[PDB]
Amino acid sequence: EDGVRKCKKCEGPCRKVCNGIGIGEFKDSLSINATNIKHFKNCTSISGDLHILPVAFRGDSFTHTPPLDPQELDILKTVKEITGFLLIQAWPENRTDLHAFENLEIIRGRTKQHGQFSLAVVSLNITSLGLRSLKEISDGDVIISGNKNLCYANTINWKKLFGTSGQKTKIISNRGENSCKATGQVCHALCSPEGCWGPEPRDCVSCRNVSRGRECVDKCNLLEGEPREFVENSECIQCHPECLPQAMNITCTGRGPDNCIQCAHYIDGPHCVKTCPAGVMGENNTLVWKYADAGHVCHLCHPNCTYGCTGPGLEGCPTNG
Ligand SMILES: *[C@@H]1O[C@H](CO[C@@H]2O[C@@H](C)[C@@H](O)[C@@H](O)[C@@H]2O)[C@@H](O)[C@H](O)[C@H]1NC(C)=O
Ligand SMILES: *[C@@H]1O[C@H](CO)[C@@H](O)[C@H](O)[C@H]1NC(C)=O
Numbered sequence: 094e095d096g097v098r099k100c101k102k103c104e105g106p107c108r109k110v111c112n113g114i115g116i117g118e119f120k121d122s123l124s125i126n127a128t129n130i131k132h133f134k135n136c137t138s139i140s141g142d143l144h145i146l147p148v149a150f151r152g153d154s155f156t157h158t159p160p161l162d163p164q165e166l167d168i169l170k171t172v173k174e175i176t177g178f179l180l181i182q183a184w185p186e187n188r189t190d191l192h193a194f195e196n197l198e199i200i201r202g203r204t205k206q207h208g209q210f211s212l213a214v215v216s217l218n219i220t221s222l223g224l225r226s227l228k229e230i231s232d233g234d235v236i237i238s239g240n241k242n243l244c245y246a247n248t249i250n251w252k253k254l255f256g257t258s259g260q261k262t263k264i265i266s267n268r269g270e271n272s273c274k275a276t277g278q279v280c281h282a283l284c285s286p287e288g289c290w291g292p293e294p295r296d297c298v299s300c301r302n303v304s305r306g307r308e309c310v311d312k313c314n315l316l317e318g319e320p321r322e323f324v325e326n327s328e329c330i331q332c333h334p335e336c337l338p339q340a341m342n343i344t345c346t347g348r349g350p351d352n353c354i355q356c357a358h359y360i361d362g363p364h365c366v367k368t369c370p371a372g373v374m375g376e377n378n379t380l381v382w383k384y385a386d387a388g389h390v391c392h393l394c395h396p397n398c399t400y401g402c403t404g405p406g407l408e409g410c411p412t413n414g
């Protein structure tokens with residue numbers, strides 16, 4: 094079970110806040126060129142505005158700045174929050190989606206491009222967006238234009254991502270819905286009609302049937318197979334290992350050990366245990382000992398037999414060394 098959300102702190106070391114292009118250390122910097130991209134490494138929140146103009150990839154000779162290698166973009170795969178706006182005006186052809194932003198989830202929109210835009214994806218040689226993680230575009234309007242071979246962008250119900258009232262969404266002159274559907278570049282079957290960031294089941298706004306981890310799936314593993322799961326708000330989560338997987342019925346009502354049908358080993362109180370407690374330091378700083386009934390029910394053993402137990406009460410306890 095992936096019961097722990099972040100695992101160790103939040104990532105490897107953990108969360109860092111960096112300034113945006115044209116603000117702070119990147120003052121008087123027009124775009125994210127091959128000079129300041131290295132200062133965005135190990136950074137979860139990039140407060141401010143991000144800019145990727147053609148100058149970054151071409152290289153500006155007069156500012157002693159070099160051309161950007163498309164493999165450097167992966168330095169932004171750690172960014173998930175943008176307090177200002179994201180302005181992407183140029184991106185390579187060897188990549189069909191916004192590869193570097195595969196983990197961006199929240200874009201606030203305090204700062205806006207021309208006081209109107211939060212997301213600007215214009216003139217890009219891509220075929221899909223691939224912003225699978227983006228859940229909220231808080232304020233600014235969205236512009237997606239001049240992306241000749243780009244499909245799937247018109248599918249997204251931007252109303253779900255929007256927060257502020259009247260958020261306009263200029264999605265014009267891309268790869269028409271006529272050609273997109275005729276070539277099989279439509280939203281996935283497992284993907285709900287609420288739009289998708291591409292064809293892959295992971296690229297999805299919401300799931301039509303259910304989800305599991307980072308994918309839209311049809312089955313939830315309730316009645317059979319790999320770890321028996323239960324459905325909670327369109328999500329598949331496996332029942333506690335100490336729950337005998339039942340056929341004809343679902344293995345659990347919830348997440349915990351005490352929320353399942355029947356324990357595969359013994360049963361201490363409401364909890365399903367692999368063995369009855371045999372000398373555990375109890376919450377009252379004292380060793381707790383128990384025994385197993387005929388029906389596998391853990392009962393507290395007699396106080397007299399302290400360093401061990403076999404049956405009920407004060408019966409059988411002197412062992413031969
Ligand atoms: C969505 O799921 C449909 C089946 O129904 C659902 O799944 C079964 C296993 C049961 O849990 C049932 O109670 C659910 O309502 C499929 O027929 C359908 O093909 C699925 N959709 C797609 C796009 O695959
Ligand atoms: C970035 O994080 C990785 C772990 O994900 C760590 O090994 C590395 O040293 C970090 N780099 C810097 C410059 O902090």
Ligand SMILES: *[C@@H]1O[C@H](CO)[C@@H](O)[C@H](O)[C@H]1NC(C)=O
Binds near residue numbers: 341342343
């Ligand atoms: C499954 O267990 C629940 C809980 O007691 C019960 O209400 C239901 O009738 C059972 N269904 C089957 C098919 O065993």
